[PDB]
From Swiss-Prot, chain A:
PANTHER family: ACTIN (PTHR11937)
Protein name: Actin, cytoplasmic 1
Organism: Xenopus laevis (African clawed frog)
Purpose of the protein: Actin is a highly conserved protein that polymerizes to produce filaments that form cross-linked networks in the cytoplasm of cells. Actin exists in both monomeric (G-actin) and polymeric (F-actin) forms, both forms playing key functions, such as cell motility and contraction. In addition to their role in the cytoplasmic cytoskeleton, G- and F-actin also localize in the nucleus, and regulate gene transcription and motility and repair of damaged DNA.
Transmembrane stretches, start-end: none
Keyword Hydrolase: yes
Gene of this entry: actb
From Swiss-Prot, chain B:
Coiled coil start-end: none
Subcellular location per the Swiss-Prot or TrEMBL entry: Cytoplasm, Cytoskeleton, Microtubule organizing center, Centrosome
Residues of the whole record sequence present: 726 to 786 of 906
Gene, per the UniProt record: tubgcp3
Protein name as catalogued: Gamma-tubulin complex component 3 homolog
Quaternary structure, from the entry: Interacts with gamma-tubulin.
Family of the protein in this entry: Belongs to the TUBGCP family.
Task performed by this protein: Necessary for the recruitment of gamma-tubulin to the centrosome and for the formation of a functional centrosome.
UniProtKB/Swiss-Prot annotation, chain C:
Keyword field: Cytoplasm, Cytoskeleton, GTP-binding, Microtubule, Nucleotide-binding
Subcellular location: Cytoplasm, Cytoskeleton, Microtubule organizing center, Centrosome; Cytoplasm, Cytoskeleton, Spindle
Pfam families reported for this sequence: Tubulin, Tubulin_C
Organism in which the protein naturally occurs: Xenopus laevis (African clawed frog)
Gene Ontology molecular-function annotations: GTP binding; microtubule nucleator activity; tubulin binding
Free-text function comment from the UniProt entry: Tubulin is the major constituent of microtubules. The gamma chain is found at microtubule organizing centers (MTOC) such as the spindle poles or the centrosome, suggesting that it is involved in the minus-end nucleation of microtubule assembly.
SMART domains: Tubulin, Tubulin_C
Identification of the protein by name: Tubulin gamma-1 chain
One BP term from GO: mitotic spindle organization
Lineage per the UniProt record: Eukaryota, Metazoa, Chordata, Craniata, Vertebrata
Superkingdom of source: Eukaryota
GO CC annotation terms, alphabetical: centrosome; cytoplasm; gamma-tubulin complex; gamma-tubulin ring complex; mitotic spindle microtubule; nucleus; polar microtubule; spindle
Family from the record: Belongs to the tubulin family.
Amino acid sequence: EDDIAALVVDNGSGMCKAGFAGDDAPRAVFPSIVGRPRHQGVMVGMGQKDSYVGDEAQSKRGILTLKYPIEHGIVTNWDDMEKIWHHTFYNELRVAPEEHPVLLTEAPLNPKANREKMTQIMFETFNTPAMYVAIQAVLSLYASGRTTGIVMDSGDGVTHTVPIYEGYALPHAILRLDLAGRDLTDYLMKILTERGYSFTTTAEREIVRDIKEKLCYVALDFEQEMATAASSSSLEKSYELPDGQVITIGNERFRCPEALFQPSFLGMESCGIHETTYNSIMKCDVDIRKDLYANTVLSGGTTMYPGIADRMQKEITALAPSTMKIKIIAPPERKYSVWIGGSILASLSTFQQMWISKQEYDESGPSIVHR
Amino acid sequence: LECSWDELWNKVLKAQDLDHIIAAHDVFLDTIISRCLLDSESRALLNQLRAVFDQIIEFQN
Amino acid sequence: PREIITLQLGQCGNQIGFEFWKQLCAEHGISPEGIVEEFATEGTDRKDVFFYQADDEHYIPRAVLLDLEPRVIHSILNSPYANLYNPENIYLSEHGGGAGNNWASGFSQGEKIHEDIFDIIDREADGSDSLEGFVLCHSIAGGTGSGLGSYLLERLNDRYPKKLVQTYSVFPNQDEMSHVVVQPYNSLLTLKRLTQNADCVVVLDNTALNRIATDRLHIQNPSFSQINQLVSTIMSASTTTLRYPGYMNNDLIGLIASLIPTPRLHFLMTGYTPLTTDQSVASVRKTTVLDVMRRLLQPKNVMVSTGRDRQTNHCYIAILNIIQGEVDPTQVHKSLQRIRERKLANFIPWGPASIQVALSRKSPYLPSAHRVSGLMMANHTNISSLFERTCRQYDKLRKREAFLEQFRKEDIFKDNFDELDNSREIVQQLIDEYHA
Amino acid sequence: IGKSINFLHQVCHDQTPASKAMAVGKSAESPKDAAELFTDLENAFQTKIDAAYFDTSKYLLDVLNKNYNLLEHMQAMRRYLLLGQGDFIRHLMDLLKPELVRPATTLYQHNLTGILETAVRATNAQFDNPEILKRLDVRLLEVSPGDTGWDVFSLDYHVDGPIATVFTRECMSHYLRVFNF
C-alpha cells in the first residue's frame, strides 16, 4: 500500500530519524556521522568495510575523525550526504526505496539551488518511485493537530521561528538566529571549568549533551532561583561518572536555560529566543497575528525540559501586548514531533496526488520541486 | 603463500552468503596442505623436504 | 628486538644519516615530537625497529653523531629539527678539534675521547633487549670520517663479536683531488679493516652519482646538499622487511647473509629506480611490476661506476630484487621469469646462484603509496674496477712524496705502506677468482 | 534460506532478518491465498524469496560484523600459524628459543603462555581492543617429554561461539600439519 509502506525519513539537523509510517516514534534515530579512513591498512574493531558510517562510526571515534554530512542543519557536501541516506535505508531499516514512497524533509531557509539538488539524488541514485519534499516546520505543527501557528523550532540546528498561515508560510518572517543546542552544550563545558572539572576526553563531552536534557531542570524565574541559591535551596545534583572527573549541576543549572534569553553568556549581541519570537511576529500582517499567538508550538531538542512550558508562558506576555491570548502548546516529546508529523502525513488522504514522481520529473527535470 | 592469500581474502568480500564463506575456505585449506607437505601423491617431494631437514642439523653441529 | 645503533661519522656521513632520520618520521606518518594519526600504528606494525620504545609517545632514534668538524652537528641546531634529536645522547656538543684532513688526527681522537665514545653507545643501548649490531654510517670523505672509522672497527669487533657489522661507505670524487687530498691514503687503510675486521660493506661512488645526476636530476654540479637525498632512500629500503612485515629474511642479517659468497668479496652494488617521481598522474594506469624489474639488474641506476666491457667476462652470483606493495603481487613470480629469457645479468653455473624476491607493505603517506619502487642489491665481481683505480691513485701520490712524512708525525714512524698495498692486491685477486 | 535463520540462532535472536516488513508479509499472505478461487501462487512465489534471500544473507554477515569479527579472524590465524608476517613470528621465535631447546616439563605450559602475552606487547599494541590477542593460545601434543621441545610446540588459534561454525574440526588439524613444515 503506502498507508504503512511509506518510509519516513526525517533528516534532522544532526540525527537522521528513519522509520515506517503509522507509529508514534521513529524506529532508529542516531546522530549522523561519517568517517573516512586516511590510510587503509589492517583494520581494528568492526570487520572489513570501505567506510565506517553512522552507528558503526559512533562505536569507534578515536580510530576515525567525525564529519557531519548535515552541518548547521544544511548539507555542506552532497557526496557523503548520499552515504548517510544509504545507511538509513539498508542498515537501519532494510527495504529498497523503489516500491515504497519516501517522505524526506527540508529546512525552512535552504536555497532553491540546494532544493533541486536533493531531488536529483533521490530520483537518480536511490531510484525512488515517488517522494515529496516537506518542511520540518509544518510537520511539527501537524503533530500538534493544527494547520496554522508559529512553531518554535529550536533543534541541533538553526533556530527557526516559522509562522505558517494555512500551510503557507510568510516569506518575510523566517528569522535565522545562530543559537543551536550544540552551542549550549559547548557553553556548559567552559563554565564547568570555573568549578575546576575540565574535559580532555571526547566521550565525557558526549554525556554533557545528555545531562543538558536529563539532570538539568527549569524552574520559573531563574532570577529568584539564584536568589534562593544564596539562601541555600535544594537543587544541586552531582552525577557520578566512574572516574575522578565529576559533572555536577547547581550553580550552572539555571545559567544554561538563561542563555536562551541572554546570548551575552555566549558573548554576542544577537537576539534571544523570546526576542526572535517577538521580532518575527512583529513584521507579520496585522489581520492574521492573532492566530499565531494562540498556536505557539515548541519543537526541537533544545527545549527539552520539564518546566520550560510554563516559563515561556509567564515570560512571553511581558513582551507582546496583553490584548493578545498567547498560549504555549508544549508537548512533552518534541524531538520526534517533526517525525510524528511526517508519518501522519504518509497516512494523509489528501496527499495521494501531492506526490512528486519520476514521470513528472521526466517532463520538467529537477524543477518539478517548484510544484 | 601468495597464490592462496589472494585466493581466500579477496573472495570473501565478494560473497554474500555464509555458506559461500566456507565454499571459498574449504577449497583453500585442502590445497594449502598438498602444496606444502602432505597429500598422498607428494611423497616424492617430502622424502626430500625431510631429507634436507636433517642434513642441515648434521652440517651444523 | 633487533635494535641497531647507527654510527654516523664524517663530513658527508652525518648529513646522509641526518635525512635518514627525517625520512623515517615523514613516512611513518607521525609527528617528530609527538603522534597525531593512529593510522601510523595500524599502518606501520613495528616503529621501534630503529627507535627506542615508547612511554611518552615519542620515538627517540638510535643514533650517535661524532664528527671532528663541528659543522655537521651545528647543521642540526641551525636546522629547525631538534625534537627528533637529543643534545646529550644523540649528539654531543662538538667532537674533535681537528681541522680535519688527516687520518692520524681522527685515530688519536679516538684514543682519547675513548671513554666518551663507549659512553654514548651504552647511552643509546640502555633500552636494547638484544642488540642486532652496529651500522657504521661513515664516510671515506675527509680524514674525519675515514680516520675514526678505522678505530671503531677494531674495538666493536673485540667487545661485541656476534653482532652485525655493516658499513654504508661512500667514496669522494676521484676527478677532483682538492676535495680530499689524503684520499688515496685513507681509502686503503680503511680497506684493510673491512676485509678481515668487518663482514659486509655497501660501496657507493660520487663519480657514479654524477652519471645519474645529469640523467634525471639535471644538476651538473657535484652536490653536497642533494647528496643526502639519494642515500636516505636506499637505506630505508634495505630494512623495509624489518620495519614493515617480512616473511623470510625478515631480518636484515637475513638479507645480508644471503648476499655474501665468502669474505673479501662482499662489496655490493646498489641500484634504486625511482630517484625522482614522474609517476604522479601516470600512476593511475597502474605501473606494472612486469617491466620495471628488468632494470634492477641493468646498469641504468647503479651507484658504482665500472666499464661496460666487464659485464661479460665477470659474473653476478647473488642479486636481491625487493618489490613493495600492491602491484598485482601474484604476477611477481612472472616478472622473475622474464629475467632469465633476457639474461640482464649472467650467472655462474658453478654452484648456486639466486634471484631473491620479497615484498613488504608501503608507507602510510601518499607520495610513497602507488609509486613502485625497486631495490637492487647486486654483488658483481667487476667491482674491482673502482679498486684498481683507487690503488692506481695510491701508488702515484707516494712517489710524489705527499703523506710519507706528513702523516708520520703521529702513529706511523716505520714504513708500513707496502703492507697496505700488498693486502689490497690479495683481495682483488680473490674476487676475480671466484667467477670462473 | 532455512539454514541461515538457524545461524542467527547461534547468535541467538528472535528477529526476522533486518526489517519487520518481513513480518507484515506473513500476515498479508495468509488472507491473499485464502481469498483466491482455490488457487495457489507459484510464479510470483519465487519472486519475493529473492527479496528474502538478499536480505538475510547480507544481514547474517552484518550481525557478525558488529560483534564477532569473523573475516578479521580470517586474516588473524594466518599471521600466527600460516606465518603470514615475519616480524610477529621472528620476535616470537627469538623469545621462544631458550625454552624449546630444553626437555619439556610438567610446568612447560605455564611459562609458554606468559612469554606469548609479552610477545604481543613487544611488536603489537593496536590489537588489544581486537579479540585476536584473546584468541590465541599454546598447543602441545602427545609427544613424550624426553623430546627436544621444538616439535611439540605450536600455536593455535582458539575458536569459540558462532565463529567456531566456520572453524570446523577438519580444518585446523590440517593446519597443524602445514605449521610444522
